[PDB]
């Protein structure tokens, strides 16, 4: 029953001369924005990507993101000289908020280096993570010198974001609570035996993401059923592959059961072998 806005940044430094910064924004599971290194502006991926925000308010953020990108790139380069870090460098940012029922909202600004958390924005200021190397202290020292940036991050996290997500939640209402029914079929995977059979229950085309899939003999669950990762389709629906490695033969009298919200408890049942 909740929908965090996640603004995601990937920045890559191959050498002192070659870099790229790309980004995107997710409202829950849906990608609302895209932002490529070679683009002047952030891109709106849905007709409702702007929320209740005006053109001028959106342009304000546009200019901020514009200055942020070039300044970030250079700050990392100069940090690299300072901290004697070898290229290539991998920096990621997860920033954003979520509006909670009633009033409250939590927000976050986490940054990672070569895949690990190094620091975050806590309240007013940049804070290293518990198990971050010592050089991270040196960066915190210098980052925490910049008063305007610390205030700007505060404004975005505490003010802009929660206001923005409120407009998005309203503006994408229908698309966010939309239901698309799944379709399921059975198949026979490569034999893990002999004399063992590999049974596969495929479920594809469902929206939204949360789902329940399991192999069963009657009303009993088959502990040993390995569900897969819930995989993305290009049309923003989802796919799933539940396997079962069973001996013989029997069963035989075995059934894959799919539960989604589409789909008001009228589960899709498929019996082996009807494929």
């Amino acid at each position, epitope marked *: 029953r909740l929908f965090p806005l996640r603004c995601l940044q990937i920045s890559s430094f191959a050498n002192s001369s070659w870099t790229r910064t790309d980004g995107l924004a997710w409202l829950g599971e849906l990608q609302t924005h895209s932002w490529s290194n070679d683009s002047d502006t952030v891109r709106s991926l849905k007709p409702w990507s702007q929320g209740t925000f005006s053109d001028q308010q959106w342009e304000t953020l546009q200019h901020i993101f514009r200055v942020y990108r070039s300044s970030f790139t250079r*700050d990392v380069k*100069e940090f690299a000289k*300072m901290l004697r870090l070898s290229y290539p460098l991998e920096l990621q940012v997860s920033a954003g908020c979520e509006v909670h029922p009633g009033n409250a909202s939590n927000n976050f600004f986490h940054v990672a280096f070569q895949g690990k958390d190094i620091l975050s924005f806590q309240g007013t200021s940049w804070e290293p993570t518990q198990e971050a190397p010592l050089w991270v202290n*040196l960066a915190i020292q210098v*980052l925490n*010198q*910049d008063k*305007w940036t610390r205030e700007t991050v505060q404004w975005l996290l505490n003010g802009t974001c929660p206001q923005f997500v409120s407009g998005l939640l309203e503006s994408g209402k229908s698309e966010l609570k939309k239901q698309v029914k799944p379709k399921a079929w059975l198949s026979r995977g490569p034999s893990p035996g002999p004399g063992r059979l590999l049974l596969v229950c495929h479920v594809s085309g469902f929206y939204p993401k949360p789902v329940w899939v399991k192999w069963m003999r009657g009303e009993q669950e088959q502990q040993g059923t390995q569900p897969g990762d819930i995989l993305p389709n290009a049309d923003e629906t989802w796919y799933l592959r539940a396997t079962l490695d069973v001996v013989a033969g029997e069963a035989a009298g075995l059934s894959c059961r799919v539960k989604h919200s589409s789909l008001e408890g009228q589960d899709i049942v498929l019996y082996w072998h009807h494929h």
Partner: T-cell receptor, first 113, second 116 residues
Framework: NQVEQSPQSLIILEGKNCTLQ??????????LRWYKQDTGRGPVSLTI?????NTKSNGRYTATLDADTKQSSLHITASQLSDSASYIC?????????????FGRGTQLTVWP | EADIYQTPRYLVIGTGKKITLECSQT?????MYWYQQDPGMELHLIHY???????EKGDLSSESTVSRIRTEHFPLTLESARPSHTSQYLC??????????????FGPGTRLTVTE
């Protein structure tokens, strides 16, 4: 250079007011500083201003800023002989120590009696 | 201004010989700078530092070297004096001041003349 000062040099009589200009293309913009440097000495800081400030004073030195036209000037009130120095415009692109300082060439002011 | 020192104030030395210019500060500012200035001309950044064992190269090319082995000392060296090194050399530090801005503090400078 991303900081230009005008004029290169000027000669004035004492007890006069004068205005020295500074234009910058630097971005992003954090703050601008004016330095007085007497020949054979380190620069001494006259003023520092941020984008939100249009004026600052230090005795007979008044620095103005217009952030829209990336333009500053230093107005010297009632010039005296000791004002004969090089005047230096310096812009910074970070509110921290991690940034560049862009130095103007300097404006050599001579004050004659 | 008063909390950053340079010795000597004036220096004369023969060509080929080694030269060391002392720059110190009683404050604990990490960020420090070396400038070169020929009379009349502008200030050229030749070296800068973010703290100990940090010795970055500046805008102007230079055969001088620096060392940052202590927070409070930023000695500059020329291993072989030559007449073209005749100039004024200005040390600087950056740190907080009267407001929330980091500002420069310039040392008095050293006048160097390399003679034959």
């Amino acid at each position: 250079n991303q900081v230009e000062q005008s004029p290169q040099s000027l000669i004035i009589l004492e007890g006069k007011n004068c205005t020295l200009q500074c234009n910058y293309t630097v971005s992003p913009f954090s703050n601008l500083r004016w330095y007085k440097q007497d020949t054979g000495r380190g620069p001494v800081s006259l003023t520092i201003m941020t984008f939100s400030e249009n004026t600052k004073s230090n005795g007979r030195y008044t620095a103005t800023l217009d952030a829209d036209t990336k333009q500053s000037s230093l107005h010297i009130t009632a010039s005296q002989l000791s004002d004969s120095a090089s005047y230096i415009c310096v812009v910074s692109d970070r509110g921290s120590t991690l940034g560049r300082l862009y130095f103007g060439r300097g404006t050599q002011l001579t004050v004659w009696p | 201004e008063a909390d950053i020192y340079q010795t000597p104030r004036y220096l004369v030395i023969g060509t080929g010989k080694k030269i060391t210019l002392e720059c110190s500060q009683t404050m604990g500012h990490d960020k420090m700078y070396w400038y070169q200035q020929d009379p009349g001309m502008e200030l050229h950044l030749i070296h800068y530092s973010y703290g100990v064992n940090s010795t970055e190269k500046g805008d102007l090319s230079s055969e001088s070297t620096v060392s940052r082995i202590r927070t409070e000392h930023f000695p500059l060296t020329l291993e072989s004096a030559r007449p073209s090194h005749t100039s004024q050399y200005l040390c600087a530090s950056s740190g907080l001041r009267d407001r929330g801005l980091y500002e420069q503090y310039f040392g008095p400078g050293t006048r160097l003349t390399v003679t034959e």
